Amino acid sequence: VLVPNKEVTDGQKNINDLNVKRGDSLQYIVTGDTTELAKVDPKTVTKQGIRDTFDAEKVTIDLSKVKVYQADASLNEKDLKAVAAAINSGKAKDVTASYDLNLDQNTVTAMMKTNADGSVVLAMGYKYLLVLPFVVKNVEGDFENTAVQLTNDGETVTNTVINHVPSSNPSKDVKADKNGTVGSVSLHDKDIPLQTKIYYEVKSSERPANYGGITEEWGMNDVLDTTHDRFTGKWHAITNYDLKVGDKTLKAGTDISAYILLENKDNKDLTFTMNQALLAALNEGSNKVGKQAWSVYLEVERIKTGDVENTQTENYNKELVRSNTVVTHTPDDPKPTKAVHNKKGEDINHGKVARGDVLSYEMTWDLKGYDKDFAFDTVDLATGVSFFDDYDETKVTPIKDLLRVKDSKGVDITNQFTISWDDAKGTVTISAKDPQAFILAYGGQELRVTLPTKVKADVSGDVYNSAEQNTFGQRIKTNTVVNHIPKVNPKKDVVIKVGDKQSQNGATIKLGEKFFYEFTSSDIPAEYAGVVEEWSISDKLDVKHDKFSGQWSVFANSNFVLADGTKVNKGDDISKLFTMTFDKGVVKITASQAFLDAMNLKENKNVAHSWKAFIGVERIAAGDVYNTIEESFNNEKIKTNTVVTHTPE
Amino acid sequence: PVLVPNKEVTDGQKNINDLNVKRGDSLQYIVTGDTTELAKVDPKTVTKQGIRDTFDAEKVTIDLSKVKVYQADASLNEKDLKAVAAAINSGKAKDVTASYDLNLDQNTVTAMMKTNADGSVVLAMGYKYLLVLPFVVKNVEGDFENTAVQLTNDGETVTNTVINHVPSSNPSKDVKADKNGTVGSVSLHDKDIPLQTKIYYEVKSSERPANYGGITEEWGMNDVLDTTHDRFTGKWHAITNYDLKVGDKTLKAGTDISAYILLENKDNKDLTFTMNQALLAALNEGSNKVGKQAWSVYLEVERIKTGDVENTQTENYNKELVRSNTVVTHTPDDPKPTKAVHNKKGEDINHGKVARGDVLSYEMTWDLKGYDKDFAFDTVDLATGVSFFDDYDETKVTPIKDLLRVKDSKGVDITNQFTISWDDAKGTVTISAKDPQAFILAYGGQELRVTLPTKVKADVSGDVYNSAEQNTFGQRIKTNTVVNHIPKVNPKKDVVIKVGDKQSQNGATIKLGEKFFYEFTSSDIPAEYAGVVEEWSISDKLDVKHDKFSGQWSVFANSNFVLADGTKVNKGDDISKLFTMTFDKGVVKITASQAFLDAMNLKENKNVAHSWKAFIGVERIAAGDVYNTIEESFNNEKIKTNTVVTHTPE
Ligand SMILES: [Mg+2]
Ligand SMILES: [Mg+2]
């Protein structure tokens, strides 16, 4: 036979049985020797050509690029470098126009043209090389090629070549960005806080091992939703396999950013392409033994709430393939708030209160944007999940046992936190014991913090509270609330008869003379926002000088109604609404519950309220006699001024 | 006639009958014998005139040399004790003590007028004669009374009886936390106080009683510090415990009176705090004697030595000293956490040379021996936590996070009491108790054991330091540092014609059909290797289109060693029987058998470095350039050799 030969080539070497990739531009070369046919009369050669059967499902052949060359029969067609030099030098002569070429589906035929006498027009004694340039489609699996040499009425088959197109697709992921370093956990389908910077990971497909193609271009494109993702300009690229460049091996994982060109259109349409030096290195033989792949990390700031999708499109040899689509979600920032209530549950911001009153601070702890889908890898978990409150320790005292945290269903969950008190600075920090576990079981809702405090005795002025939420370092402050503590000043005086105008403070009281100690209570202001639950005076009498025989009265210093409607006018005797005990030389006069209830009625909040008390005594010995009264309001004691009377001996 | 003598008790200005007094008070009894009715009789018939006073010598002290008699105008009101004191001071009431015979016998003072030759008393009748008996209250309890009798010739008339009370009240000492200079509210008595803690000693005065009739002449408290344990820092403050009016201002209970207190400081050891003259004067104002008076000093000391530390104070009230109770605190040694590094067999390998894939198991002690239920929690900020920190070299080892453990001194795993925080960027792990105070009550008082296993990374070399640190409520104590070494390795691939050859054919032409060998030289296992090799193998992915392998392979010993059963192996020996071969998917894999691994981990072989050479026989099949690279796996960690190349023409 004639032994026609068939090879597949990248243009320099035999690439039979090698892996190729979408868009590869390669060649088949079929040689039909006519050396043996040079021995007969050339006029007896009336048919000469090649019928080539290729796989049009997997490769594309442009008939206008098909060529036939007349080579010296000494040329070793197996030496594909020598063939390319021969084609380039002209020692393999282009004779294509002396052939009839046809393409039909899987079939390319090249037959020599014939003279009028029927004999083929080209000389025998030469090797004729049919060159079929082809382009690999974006397909999977094998493709074979075989040919037949046609000589007059006979046919001889060539050897069969084959190439493979292994599967590999581009992909995209989302990674955390800790001060520029890439995290190692995927953030797909997770929740990213506003202003967090994250990495988009755009991963090329893999170039297969034992590569017989040529990487002519390699690029990755990412079009960003610029209303949600702000490209910061910071990016890097790494090689995912060992890559030799010049005299050095760039090991797998090494940065190759310098070899990647960025085309940035308005921070929206970003294209990363390999430069010429890198493409040249990829085409060197040792880099085709193993796989090659690369990935780009591009940094975006999340600037808007919602669901944010990302996709990339990989260009390999002009063949575009889109990756998977990744999504992340961005919630509204937390909106923690602060309020102040009284003991009845009523809101009393800006309200005036008195010693011993309960100021119940109620805060919302807003964890609606932090739940099981949170991107924990974006934060330093050790910074904790906490709530902080800065109260005025010079004016209020927290009831530490009653600090509670409740969830949105009203369930006490205080036991999930450690509570740290800083008494000197007057702050309290509530910290989740197990932050990640806490976000999983209790996140996704608003929590309610209750911080009861009590107004101190003998302080006045404005009382501020503020608070702050700290979620893994995201610090959001609440509003500030304020209460007012008007100064009070209960007084003691001395009068001869109940209702006298002339003070006897500092005056002479004779032996056997009867007189009255007079008391004026603290004022509760108009629109008082607290709740008075106790109101009394204690007068420790100097029993050797002042003799108490049970005489006392209390008078209204304001107009008010009782719960049962009965009116009380300023100056009225209301001793019926008070009680008196005398024990261990102490006169104690105490407001009844009927009087307290009256002081707390909304109907009486239009005016301020106070009362006057009188304690009847007889001076029974000589000397100087001091008197001070202790007034108790909400069980908090303060002292009147100290009065003085003189009984000379 | 008839006579009514009077007896009064005074602080010098006022009637103090029935009032409360205090140790060391300086007071006076005054007995008035009126002789106005006796002025009408013949003075020669008055032959005996005087007073016999009966006091409580068990409760007050009278010095006879201070007893005086004054001759006062009969119009002087001896009940106006201010008027009496002025008359005595000016001489308007004349001192006639020289005309009296005075005597003190136990509970009795007698003062009798002297007499002329005829027996008549030497002093004129018609005056009031005031006998003044100054006394000092002793440190006693309960009541003391005084009564006198006026003697007129053979008659006797008793005076009224006066009485005072000595209510009991002692000084005290306590110990309070010192947080940023503010005083804690929890008593640290008998609690555990770490070294370098600043605490407040609280020295509290006794109480001056309500309804006071005395005079506070001086008031001080003294504290002698043990300067080997307590370093006085120089800062202190004082508070009043009751309302104290000064001038026309009222210092309410609890407010600071430091400006009125003086500190005499002898060498930071002997501290005495005393009320200044302005405060003493305010304490004598009448309104300040109605109710109680008392004060406290807070003095700051740094605890600078371990052991049991006692403190006591001595209160000086009107020169009478009373010692307070004695408080005690305890100071244990600081924690002594340690760090060690063990290989996978459990041997300590500090300074040991190690290799890729080897386990460096860091074992640390977490010393909480001094932190138990008696700990003074009020001295620390609880938010600072209870934690243990390890800073490993993240560029050379990687931790096996799932195997981090904490155990107590009884071997119980307690890892779930802690939050484990990994910082991969700085290469640290922080182990913090979820509930720090509760954790100390439940698990404090023992030594905990922390296990942090790590593996050596592939393709790294040099020194590997590890250190750790114990943070107990802000008390930071470092462990020792351990170090390991990772000698560089360089397994290589080469090309030769025959196994023994030395002429490298890397980069040379090998003709078509020619048979040759790929040569591999393993990584070195160092002399004195401290790790453990559990896997050692090479994989060579052959270019099957060009290199034809048909089962020819050899492994040569590159060092001398011995086996478990005794067999001796020399350098250059063929040891292929201690290796196995597979040829799957064009990849030749040559693997060390367990018996060769067992050999490389024997102590007997540790004197020398160890490696091996392998040879893979191949026949070249096609023309063109042919590349070869080998991946060597050591403890399942892969690194690759140099890449060789050969050329075949035609
Ligand atoms: Mg505060
Ligand atoms: Mg580190």
XYZ file of N, CA, C and O in Angstrom, chain A residues 13 16 18 76 78-79 181 184 210 242 251 284-286 289 380-382 417-425 429 432-435 458 542 544 624 626 637-639 642 649, chain B residues 14-15 18 77 79-82 179-180 182 185 211 243 252 285-287 290 378 381-383 419 421-425 433-436 459 541 543 545 625 627 640 643 650:
336
model
N 4.464 20.516 17.538
C 4.689 19.172 18.061
C 3.485 18.277 17.799
O 2.380 18.744 17.504
N -1.106 14.174 19.518
C -2.029 13.045 19.579
C -2.217 12.558 21.016
O -1.250 12.406 21.770
N -3.571 14.084 23.495
C -3.423 15.117 24.509
C -4.750 15.832 24.770
O -5.671 15.814 23.947
N 10.404 14.529 6.675
C 9.806 13.658 7.678
C 8.556 14.347 8.200
O 8.637 15.243 9.039
N 6.480 13.234 10.178
C 6.358 12.984 11.614
C 7.037 14.062 12.446
O 6.703 14.237 13.622
N 8.010 14.768 11.876
C 8.704 15.849 12.577
C 7.922 17.129 12.328
O 8.154 17.844 11.354
N -6.469 40.528 54.000
C -6.190 39.108 53.844
C -7.487 38.349 53.578
O -8.539 38.663 54.144
N -11.158 32.145 54.499
C -11.228 30.804 53.936
C -12.598 30.147 54.076
O -12.713 28.940 53.845
N -1.439 17.637 30.769
C -1.060 17.108 29.452
C -1.737 17.905 28.335
O -2.411 17.359 27.455
N 1.515 25.115 40.246
C 2.898 25.475 39.940
C 3.021 26.008 38.515
O 2.573 25.367 37.553
N 5.298 28.892 42.747
C 4.591 27.773 43.352
C 3.099 28.064 43.469
O 2.656 29.216 43.456
N 5.070 27.399 27.447
C 6.291 26.616 27.527
C 5.942 25.183 27.940
O 4.931 24.930 28.599
N 6.765 24.229 27.501
C 6.403 22.826 27.647
C 6.173 22.392 29.085
O 5.224 21.665 29.383
N 7.041 22.812 30.004
C 6.916 22.250 31.344
C 5.626 22.698 32.032
O 5.121 21.982 32.905
N 2.489 20.212 31.318
C 2.413 18.882 31.915
C 1.276 18.808 32.926
O 0.465 17.876 32.908
N -14.235 39.700 64.235
C -13.467 39.090 65.311
C -14.477 38.684 66.379
O -15.020 39.547 67.077
N -14.738 37.379 66.501
C -15.777 36.925 67.422
C -15.469 37.297 68.870
O -16.392 37.455 69.677
N -14.188 37.415 69.217
C -13.768 37.735 70.579
C -14.203 39.123 71.032
O -14.142 39.412 72.234
N -26.267 36.121 79.713
C -25.277 37.187 79.703
C -24.525 37.225 81.023
O -25.059 36.830 82.060
N -23.290 37.727 80.977
C -22.604 38.195 82.176
C -22.846 39.693 82.301
O -22.859 40.417 81.300
N -23.050 40.150 83.530
C -23.364 41.543 83.827
C -22.211 42.112 84.639
O -21.967 41.661 85.757
N -21.500 43.088 84.078
C -20.330 43.695 84.710
C -20.677 45.110 85.147
O -21.025 45.950 84.313
N -20.545 45.388 86.441
C -20.844 46.710 86.974
C -19.545 47.457 87.239
O -18.608 46.896 87.818
N -19.490 48.712 86.809
C -18.378 49.616 87.089
C -18.939 50.765 87.931
O -19.382 51.789 87.403
N -18.894 50.600 89.254
C -19.567 51.555 90.132
C -18.906 52.929 90.088
O -19.597 53.955 90.138
N -17.577 52.971 89.970
C -16.869 54.248 89.937
C -17.311 55.097 88.751
O -17.663 56.276 88.905
N -17.298 54.516 87.553
C -17.728 55.261 86.386
C -19.233 55.227 86.174
O -19.729 55.944 85.303
N -22.164 46.750 81.719
C -21.974 46.081 80.436
C -22.580 44.686 80.509
O -22.262 43.910 81.417
N -22.959 38.696 76.080
C -23.290 37.299 75.836
C -22.150 36.400 76.301
O -20.982 36.660 75.999
N -22.493 35.351 77.051
C -21.480 34.406 77.518
C -20.855 33.642 76.357
O -19.654 33.360 76.368
N -21.659 33.295 75.350
C -21.222 32.494 74.205
C -21.747 33.195 72.960
O -22.871 32.930 72.524
N -20.971 34.118 72.379
C -21.566 35.068 71.412
C -22.127 34.418 70.158
O -23.280 34.682 69.792
N -30.843 63.681 98.675
C -30.001 64.875 98.807
C -29.180 65.158 97.546
O -28.032 65.597 97.618
N -35.803 65.921 122.848
C -34.940 66.004 124.028
C -35.872 65.887 125.229
O -36.381 66.882 125.752
N -35.687 65.376 128.276
C -35.409 66.075 129.522
C -35.805 67.544 129.471
O -35.934 68.175 130.525
N -30.288 75.276 126.632
C -30.445 75.380 125.185
C -30.989 74.066 124.641
O -30.544 72.988 125.041
N -32.002 72.068 121.060
C -31.991 71.979 119.606
C -33.061 71.016 119.131
O -33.381 70.025 119.797
N -34.304 59.390 103.730
C -34.352 60.384 104.792
C -33.463 61.586 104.474
O -32.356 61.437 103.948
N -33.973 62.785 104.780
C -33.202 64.027 104.791
C -33.644 64.847 106.000
O -34.722 64.637 106.563
N -32.791 65.774 106.420
C -33.000 66.496 107.669
C -33.412 67.935 107.393
O -32.907 68.569 106.459
N -31.793 72.869 111.685
C -31.812 72.674 113.132
C -32.189 73.988 113.804
O -31.548 75.019 113.561
N -31.673 79.662 133.098
C -31.864 79.250 134.489
C -31.351 80.337 135.417
O -31.692 81.513 135.248
N -21.771 74.404 131.011
C -23.166 74.002 130.984
C -23.426 72.923 132.028
O -22.528 72.177 132.421
N -24.688 72.836 132.453
C -25.167 71.706 133.239
C -25.205 70.448 132.378
O -25.919 70.400 131.367
N -27.102 63.977 133.880
C -27.790 62.913 133.145
C -27.300 62.732 131.709
O -27.836 61.862 131.001
N -25.696 83.160 140.544
C -26.583 82.019 140.318
C -25.708 80.829 139.955
O -25.247 80.711 138.818
N -26.420 78.033 139.228
C -27.025 77.259 138.146
C -26.679 77.807 136.768
O -26.877 77.106 135.770
N -26.181 79.039 136.689
C -25.680 79.603 135.435
C -24.192 79.286 135.351
O -23.340 80.087 135.733
N -23.879 78.105 134.809
C -22.503 77.625 134.817
C -21.575 78.461 133.945
O -20.375 78.517 134.222
N -22.100 79.131 132.916
C -21.296 80.117 132.199
C -20.913 81.275 133.111
O -19.779 81.766 133.059
N -10.621 50.509 93.850
C -10.799 50.455 92.396
C -10.732 51.870 91.840
O -11.673 52.656 91.987
N -9.598 52.193 91.215
C -9.369 53.496 90.601
C -9.397 54.612 91.641
O -9.679 55.769 91.325
N -11.511 54.735 94.229
C -12.769 54.716 94.966
C -12.816 53.520 95.911
O -12.196 52.479 95.668
N -17.304 48.478 98.670
C -18.280 48.290 99.730
C -18.266 46.879 100.290
O -19.086 46.565 101.159
N -26.344 63.021 122.925
C -26.524 63.761 124.181
C -25.206 63.808 124.956
O -25.097 63.360 126.100
N -23.743 63.664 110.607
C -23.807 65.102 110.381
C -22.927 65.846 111.377
O -23.040 65.659 112.594
N -22.603 66.554 105.764
C -23.564 65.490 105.989
C -22.833 64.164 106.141
O -21.684 64.013 105.723
N -19.325 72.619 119.383
C -20.565 73.367 119.246
C -21.742 72.521 119.711
O -21.758 71.300 119.524
N -22.729 73.180 120.325
C -23.804 72.448 120.985
C -24.590 71.542 120.051
O -24.960 70.423 120.419
N -24.867 72.005 118.833
C -25.684 71.179 117.947
C -24.992 69.864 117.614
O -25.665 68.848 117.395
N -25.786 66.849 120.148
C -27.107 66.223 120.215
C -27.048 64.790 119.710
O -27.542 63.861 120.360
N -13.837 41.708 94.547
C -14.121 43.137 94.483
C -12.896 43.965 94.107
O -13.053 45.143 93.765
N -11.597 44.087 87.975
C -12.653 44.299 86.995
C -13.020 42.930 86.432
O -12.239 42.337 85.679
N -14.213 42.432 86.773
C -14.604 41.098 86.323
C -14.725 41.008 84.805
O -14.637 39.904 84.253
N -14.905 42.137 84.117
C -15.052 42.110 82.662
C -13.765 41.709 81.955
O -13.813 41.279 80.792
N -14.724 29.645 75.941
C -14.834 30.102 74.568
C -13.437 30.090 73.952
O -12.495 30.625 74.544
N -11.086 31.268 70.969
C -11.004 32.309 69.950
C -9.699 32.172 69.171
O -8.616 32.362 69.734
N -9.809 31.870 67.877
C -8.659 31.721 66.989
C -8.432 33.014 66.216
O -9.361 33.545 65.603
N -7.197 33.514 66.240
C -6.772 34.630 65.394
C -5.726 34.098 64.417
O -4.537 34.026 64.743
N -6.170 33.740 63.210
C -5.257 33.142 62.239
C -4.224 34.144 61.733
O -3.119 33.744 61.349
N -4.546 35.440 61.741
C -3.624 36.434 61.194
C -2.422 36.644 62.111
O -1.274 36.668 61.654
N -12.948 31.796 79.959
C -14.096 31.253 80.670
C -15.370 31.985 80.264
O -15.386 33.213 80.135
N -16.445 31.217 80.058
C -17.713 31.818 79.652
C -18.340 32.626 80.786
O -18.930 33.689 80.548
N -18.222 32.138 82.018
C -18.685 32.837 83.222
C -17.523 32.912 84.206
O -17.340 32.006 85.032
N -16.722 33.986 84.161
C -15.455 33.983 84.927
C -15.603 33.832 86.436
O -14.889 33.012 87.036
N 7.245 22.748 53.242
C 8.014 23.787 52.550
C 8.260 25.023 53.419
O 8.151 26.159 52.955
N 4.557 10.847 38.185
C 3.601 10.806 37.081
C 4.381 10.809 35.769
O 4.853 11.851 35.309
N 5.310 10.681 31.817
C 4.806 10.995 30.480
C 4.743 9.697 29.685
O 5.723 9.310 29.041
N 3.379 8.789 27.010
C 3.657 8.871 25.580
C 5.151 8.803 25.275
O 5.525 8.473 24.145
N 10.922 16.780 23.764
C 11.348 17.078 25.124
C 10.449 16.368 26.129
O 9.228 16.307 25.959
N 9.643 15.895 30.294
C 9.824 16.436 31.630
C 9.469 15.385 32.668
O 8.644 14.496 32.427
N 7.664 18.916 45.943
C 8.120 18.427 44.655
C 9.607 18.691 44.469
O 10.159 19.659 45.001
N 12.586 19.898 38.397
C 12.116 19.308 37.145
C 13.303 19.043 36.227
O 14.036 19.973 35.873
N 14.414 13.384 15.944
C 13.829 12.718 14.769
C 12.310 12.818 14.701
O 11.680 12.052 13.962
